[PDB]
């Protein structure tokens, strides 16, 4: 009894799987509760449509969210907000870094995603990270 699952359940593989059962089990429990569906070619095929249109439509976050490292990885920042002897001008913060994360050129930008633990408020050569796929740590130069 070919059946395609949904909310995965023990003894039966994870969601969207072509697992076999007992006719009764399916007709009187699964299907009724919407915990599965019949492996009718009509769906069994419309499933691959969930696949290719998700597996072959993944070269975007996996193969293009990456280009957020092909251009804004190897390009200096340098804080145009000088400083004292060591405590930086502009406090150098997630914002005073995200303002021109895209300004410098023109392809992508972001504000929150930053391995910025605590506001720098101190001169130096910092280089933290971003997210979520391969983490891209950008070179920030807290100049004086």
């Amino acid at each position: 009894m070919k059946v395609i699952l949904l909310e995965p359940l023990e003894n039966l593989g994870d969601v969207g799987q072509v697992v076999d059962v007992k006719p009764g089990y399916a007709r009187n429990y699964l299907l009724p509760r919407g915990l599965a569906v019949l492996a009718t070619e009509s769906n069994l095929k419309a499933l691959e449509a969930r696949i290719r249109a998700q597996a072959k439509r993944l070269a975007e976050r996996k193969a293009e969210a990456e280009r957020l490292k092909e251009i804004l990885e190897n390009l200096t920042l340098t804080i145009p907000v000088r400083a004292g002897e060591t405590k930086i001008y502009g406090s150098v913060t997630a914002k005073d870094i995200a303002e021109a994360l895209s300004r410098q050129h023109g392809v992508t930008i972001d504000p929150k995603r930053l391995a910025l633990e605590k506001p720098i408020k101190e001169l130096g050569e910092y280089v933290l990270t971003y997210k979520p796929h391969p983490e891209v740590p950008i070179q920030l130069k807290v100049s004086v």
Partner: protein
């Protein structure tokens, strides 16, 4: 009675009683010690299903049981809405 999905209905068969040992073995052969007329009914079973607004019930051979379920998917391509257990049925094929 008669299957709503496959039209199967009871047929007349003949209850044939035989005596004696076959020819396939010992010998002489089998003798009909009687032949009564009789009917064989199809394994009718009751099948209730949700489908659309109301939950309708089909009466069908155990053989053609799935055919009713695959008959509900296809139903999903129809404009039911109207609350009538009857009509929905006719509305199936």
């Amino acid at each position: 009675k008669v299957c709503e999905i496959s039209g199967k209905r009871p047929i007349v068969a003949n209850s044939i009683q035989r005596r004696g040992k076959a020819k396939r073995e010992g010998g002489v052969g089998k003798k009909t010690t009687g032949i009564s007329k009789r009917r064989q009914y199809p394994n009718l079973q009751k099948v209730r299903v949700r489908v659309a607004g109301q939950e309708i019930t089909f009466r069908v051979a155990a053989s053609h049981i799935p055919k009713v379920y695959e008959l509900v998917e296809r139903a999903k391509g129809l404009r039911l809405e109207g609350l009538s257990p009857k009509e929905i049925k006719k509305e199936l094929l």
